[PDB]
Design brief:
This is part of a larger assembly, with chains A (about 120 residues), B (about 150 residues) and C (about 140 residues). Chain A is built from 5 helices and no strands. Chain A is mainly alpha-helical and about 120 residues long. Chain A has one domain (about 1-115). Classes of the chains: A mainly alpha (about 120), B alpha/beta (about 150), C alpha/beta (about 140). The chains hardly touch. The complex binds magnesium ion (68 copies). The structure holds 5 RNA strands. Chain C: Belongs to the universal ribosomal protein uL15 family.
RNA sequence: GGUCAAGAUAGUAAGGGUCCACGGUGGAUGCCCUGGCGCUGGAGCCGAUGAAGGACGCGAUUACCUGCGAAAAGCCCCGACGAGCUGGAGAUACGCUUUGACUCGGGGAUGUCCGAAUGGGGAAACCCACCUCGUAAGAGGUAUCCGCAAGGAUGGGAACUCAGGGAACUGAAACAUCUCAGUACCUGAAGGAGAAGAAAGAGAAUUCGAUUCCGUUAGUAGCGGCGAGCGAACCCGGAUCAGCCCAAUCAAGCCGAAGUGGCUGGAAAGCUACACCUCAGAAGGUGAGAGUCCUGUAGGCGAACGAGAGGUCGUUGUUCGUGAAACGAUGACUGAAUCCGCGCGGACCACCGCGCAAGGCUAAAUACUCCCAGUGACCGAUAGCGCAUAGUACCGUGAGGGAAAGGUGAAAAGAACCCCGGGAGGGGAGUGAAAGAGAACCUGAAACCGUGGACUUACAAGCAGUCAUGGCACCUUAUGCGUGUUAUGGCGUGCCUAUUGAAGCAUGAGCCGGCGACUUAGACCUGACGUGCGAGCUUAAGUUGAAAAACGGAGGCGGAGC
RNA sequence: AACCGAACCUGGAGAUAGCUAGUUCUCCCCGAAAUGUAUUGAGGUACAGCCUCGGAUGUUGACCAUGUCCUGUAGAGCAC
RNA sequence: GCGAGAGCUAACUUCCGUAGCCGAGAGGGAAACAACCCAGACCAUCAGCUAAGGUCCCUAAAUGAUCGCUCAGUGGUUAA
RNA sequence: GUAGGGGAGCGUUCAGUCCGCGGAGAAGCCAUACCGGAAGGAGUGGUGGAGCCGACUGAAGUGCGGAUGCCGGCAUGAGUAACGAUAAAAGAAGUGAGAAUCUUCUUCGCCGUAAGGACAAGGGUUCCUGGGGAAGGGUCGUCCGCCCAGGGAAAGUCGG
RNA sequence: CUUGACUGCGAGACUGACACGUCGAGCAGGGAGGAAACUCGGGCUUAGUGAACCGGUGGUACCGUGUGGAAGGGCCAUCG
């Protein structure tokens, strides 16, 4: 017996192509360039899962430093200050305190510069 | 049927290189690796054919869908009478039945029934049997197919 | 339809090619080379282009078929045959089927009970041990 | 509020982008068959009585095809069927037919011209004659070779057969003997087969008994730049049997069982309720899937015609390559015995065995497959034959090469008539179950071209992605883990191949769709897994049976090595 | 007969091609080599070396310490 | 890199020995960068500590402390 | 983790068997936010109009992006080059659904040992009449060497 | 003084991918020199070499195609 392709190739193809909507020009309409674009997309996805974990830490840190310095303290000195007084806060959380709740962040500042004295 | 003549020049043309249009990368060419007429018939070891057949009958015994039979009773070669005979023996119609006998007319009575398949003498075999639900053995052949 | 073959009876074959699963690109064959290529040939006794081992080795002696003797043991005839005796057409029906060759009897392991044997030849220690147990050995005329 | 001032931000899109909607293009995909493919089995020649193959004709209308041949889609008789017919062609008209048409079977009559062509010629299918009869019309004859005559031959035929002649690539990892291989090809002769055949044999048992074919012996014995590699036979088991004469029943055809009602549906075969035949439930057709509606099947009937010597030199054949080279086989030279004789048995001699050369025919088993029939874990429109038909169109001076091609609908009911337009095309209407089937007519993917809508883009450096967030929009696996779209930030050197090293200014690639590449074989070799038997295991050819399989021990493998 | 250091057509013929391209579905486990010698051999092949799977063994391997023997480089030295 | 020859104690040179890496290795660093430095990625996380390397702004992190040096943009490429 | 070895699977045709769907509508096609560790797999809806899914088992012409691969369709270059001798055109008039291109008139221009006339070879109805306008004509055509129909070719003396 | 520059062997190692190559105790026959223990199967050692194939020669009586012979091969030696 013989077994043509029948139906499989087009299903594969549409699969790729349908992953690829919103891609510019032929990248979203031609199979091969879709499939290709997608390989590179692979790289970018995996990488950036790790990397976004890298990025958000960064952000938190920025905000923290800011709040720190509003009340006359560097960030680094603020964080040894916190570790000294064994306050054990996430910097995600430290950021959110710093940004959202003024007086509270203030209190943590005073506690930390005390731990520094 | 494609002439073997070279179609055009090996280099030059700017085309890819080809020699013939009878080639499996060519629409309308040859199949690369097609099927040619062959055979599949080997010799399975005898003892295994025997043990098989045996084990067929055995399987259909724990059924218990064996029905050993002596003589029959179908008037003179009539299917309606096969139907009544069958019915007396619990053959409602809701099963597929293989019948093995050496009597011309009982077979000649079964056959045209949709749900009966009819086999003379030692035309028996694991396939045909295991194919069906019930087996009509008959029984005359059974005391000889032991010894 | 109920039935299934034995686990490990039938391995599905190698379909080389068919994607990066899988043996990608080169289907086992490696990269380039005469081994890579697709043609019937080398074959098997071809070393380098060199000068072959078999070609470097000394030939010894002619060739001769001669006669070969079909072996019958004592230990066979002995222990547990209970002497149905040897004759000519009896051995066959028991177990030493050949034809076209003459029969020989050889020492094997042990002798005890006496029997009458019909061969075409036998070893010294075999006739000696078959007589020393009371049995006679028959060579043809 | 007004003027001025400083600052910040918005909208408009010429065109683009992403997504959505709706189309066009195009012909993938699915379904299908009117066409192929293989295997098995059958059947096997035609021709001077004019073949195979053609040319020109024949029609109420005739370009193609089919059929035919101036007696021209046909004429005569016989047989069958029994109502339609007047070819594919579907189209108008003429008409034929129960005094038996049409079709089927079987014989005859006619059968132009060319083609072995054969009166002579010739650039095939055209030109020119001669003779006998005849009133003319017309008819018949006029080739060569064997033969006294009668009669035979010439030509054609895919494969198969034998014979005369006889390659190379290639393998030997170079090459010359060798191998490819007595293969390809050329020529010849012939048949449905042909060849071969009735032992101056094979052989080693004082065994066998015409030949061919299958298994096996056996990759054994041997051959060989003893390299590559080449490779028997005897025995044994089968298929089929045969040895005689000369020289002193199938081909037309007919008969042939059994069902209705309600329901869905455009339509009944499907559903459902009860019902029947079956030596018949194989199959196809019927508005969808029918044992019981039609054709059929099982079974039965069935025809006037129809069919069944030795030598020496030079060489070569089989495993036979100068080898110690027997034996056959001839080209050259030469040339014996005829029975107490002759020929062989692998140099050669004796002995022991087998044999009667120089004279012929022979069916059967075997090969093939143009043609016919049945079947298929063969193909269904790039597949399968090159062809759903065509060796056509087309290309070539020629030899020769050589395509694509498929689908309304159950049924033509093939859309009267109205609207715009010269028309093409379309919108209505009408038919239809559906024109979401209208003749550019099954489905109708993708590339590719457009219309419309959403959010968007005119300070911007970019492998076009990816991550994060904000804006807008949307709510049928959807109010969240959202879907679309976007702004801005972070991050980011296409794929493949080939490489020490690829974004590379290294290779390939316009795009999408289809076709497209590790397979088959042997009864080979060697391992892994599994199964059946197990000191044993197994059959092959074949025989019979065959909607299955069983027999078949010849052989092969273990059994002891050196 | 629009390309002649040997025309063209068909066939042998799927010539040969140690050469270049190409080689298609997914996940999981281990995971190399580009060294040696030999080759009318050098971009090819044979056998080792290295990888994997399976069956055997059963700590035999690894590192590091202790013991013991071998060495002629670094340095240095000038006795040849 | 270290050890040598060859070479001009030239070569992103050539040929050997030896370790490591690339090859077949992604991740951070060295602006960029197969090889160097840190380090071997089974998957998920808007979690914590560290390595090399870094903490003025682009750019995560001390415009840190104390004792000095250089004033030449030396820093941010060579010699007698 | 490259060559390579090993392991478990996904999907495709055909085949046997079982289940079973289908005009209250199959396969195929189309959309989709659901499912599975991946090949992949379902739900619903739109299309379509007659066949087909699932399960186990068997056999393969069984899975594509590459091969300057093969057949086919459609893009880019682009409304770009070009429209085939620089002998040359103008007006009126007619026709016609439509005219720069057709017909008539008047002129103009170009060949004139030719760009005129007659044979041969070759071609094969291309000639004449009447009609036509899809394509062929490098535009356009109402026209034509194109398409349809019907006519036309005459030998004792020319050539055989 | 002599022919150990010897036949029949070879425990066990070195060494090479293979084929090769190298060293060698000890047993037998049978010898040389020594008064003897003993030593000798070439040279202080490491180069002075050529695998197969086909063939020459001396021995050998293994095979020899109906049997007995002989051609021819085989074996050990050996030359090209
Ligand atoms: Mg981290
Ligand atoms: Mg075709
Ligand atoms: Mg694998
Ligand atoms: Mg690829
Ligand atoms: Mg490659
Ligand atoms: Mg606009
Ligand atoms: Mg005709
Ligand atoms: Mg007539
Ligand atoms: Mg009649
Ligand atoms: Mg009729
Ligand atoms: Mg004639
Ligand atoms: Mg040659
Ligand atoms: Mg060669
Ligand atoms: Mg002939
Ligand atoms: Mg001769
Ligand atoms: Mg010869
Ligand atoms: Mg002779
Ligand atoms: Mg199709
Ligand atoms: Mg109309
Ligand atoms: Mg738009
Ligand atoms: Mg600016
Ligand atoms: Mg802007
Ligand atoms: Mg390079
Ligand atoms: Mg590499
Ligand atoms: Mg580039
Ligand atoms: Mg490039
Ligand atoms: Mg290159
Ligand atoms: Mg290019
Ligand atoms: Mg086993
Ligand atoms: Mg020329
Ligand atoms: Mg080729
Ligand atoms: Mg060939
Ligand atoms: Mg690993
Ligand atoms: Mg290489
Ligand atoms: Mg190896
Ligand atoms: Mg140890
Ligand atoms: Mg020194
Ligand atoms: Mg270098
Ligand atoms: Mg790296
Ligand atoms: Mg890096
Ligand atoms: Mg960086
Ligand atoms: Mg570098
Ligand atoms: Mg540090
Ligand atoms: Mg900072
Ligand atoms: Mg891994
Ligand atoms: Mg099925
Ligand atoms: Mg199907
Ligand atoms: Mg492609
Ligand atoms: Mg090109
Ligand atoms: Mg193309
Ligand atoms: Mg323009
Ligand atoms: Mg331009
Ligand atoms: Mg321009
Ligand atoms: Mg222009
Ligand atoms: Mg012009
Ligand atoms: Mg002009
Ligand atoms: Mg008018
Ligand atoms: Mg003009
Ligand atoms: Mg006028
Ligand atoms: Mg003229
Ligand atoms: Mg004419
Ligand atoms: Mg035009
Ligand atoms: Mg008009
Ligand atoms: Mg005209
Ligand atoms: Mg006249
Ligand atoms: Mg040789
Ligand atoms: Mg000799
Ligand atoms: Mg001799």
């Amino acid at each position: 017996p013989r077994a043509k392709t029948g139906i499989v190739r087009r299903r594969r193809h549409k699969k790729v192509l349908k992953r690829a909507k919103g891609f510019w020009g032929s990248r979203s309409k031609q199979y091969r360039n879709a499939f290709q674009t997608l390989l590179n997309a692979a790289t970018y996805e995996y990488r950036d899962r790790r990397n976004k974990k890298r990025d958000f830490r960064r952000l938190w840190i920025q905000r923290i430093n800011a709040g720190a310095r509003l009340h006359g303290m560097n960030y680094s000195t603020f964080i040894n200050g916190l570790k000294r007084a064994n306050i054990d806060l996430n910097r995600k959380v430290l950021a959110d305190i710093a940004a959202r709740e003024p007086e509270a962040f203030k209190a943590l500042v005073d506690a930390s510069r005390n731990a520094r004295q | 049927s494609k002439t073997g003549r070279k179609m055009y020049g090996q280099k030059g043309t700017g085309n890819a290189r080809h020699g013939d249009r009878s080639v499996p990368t060519f629409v309308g060419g040859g199949v690369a690796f097609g099927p040619k007429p062959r055979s599949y018939d080997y010799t399975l070891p005898r003892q295994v054919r025997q043990l098989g057949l045996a084990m067929a009958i055995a399987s259909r015994q724990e059924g218990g869908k064996l029905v050993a039979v002596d003589g029959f009773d179908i008037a003179d070669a009539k299917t309606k009478n096969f139907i009544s005979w069958a019915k007396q023996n619990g053959l409602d119609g809701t099963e597929k039945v293989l019948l093995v006998t050496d009597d011309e007319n009982t077979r000649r009575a079964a056959r045209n029934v949709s749900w009966v398949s009819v086999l003379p003498v030692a035309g028996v075999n694991v396939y045909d049997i295991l194919r069906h639900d019930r087996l009509v053995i008959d029984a005359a052949a059974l005391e000889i197919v032991e010894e | 339809h109920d039935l299934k073959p034995t686990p490990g009876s039938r391995k599905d074959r190698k379909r080389v090619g068919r994607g990066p699963g899988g043996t990608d690109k080169t289907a086992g064959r490696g990269h380039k080379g005469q081994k890579s290529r697709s043609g019937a040939g080398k074959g098997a006794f071809f070393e380098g282009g060199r000068s072959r081992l078999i070609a470097r080795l000394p030939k010894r002696g002619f060739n001769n078929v001669g006669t070969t003797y079909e072996v019958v043991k004592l230990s066979q005839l002995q222990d547990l045959e209970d002497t149905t005796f040897d004759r000519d057409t009896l051995e066959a029906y028991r177990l030493v089927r050949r034809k076209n060759r003459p029969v020989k009897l050889l020492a094997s392991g042990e002798i005890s009970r006496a029997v009458t044997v019909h061969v075409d030849a036998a070893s010294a220690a075999a006739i000696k041990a078959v007589e020393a147990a009371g049995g006679r050995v028959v060579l043809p005329e």
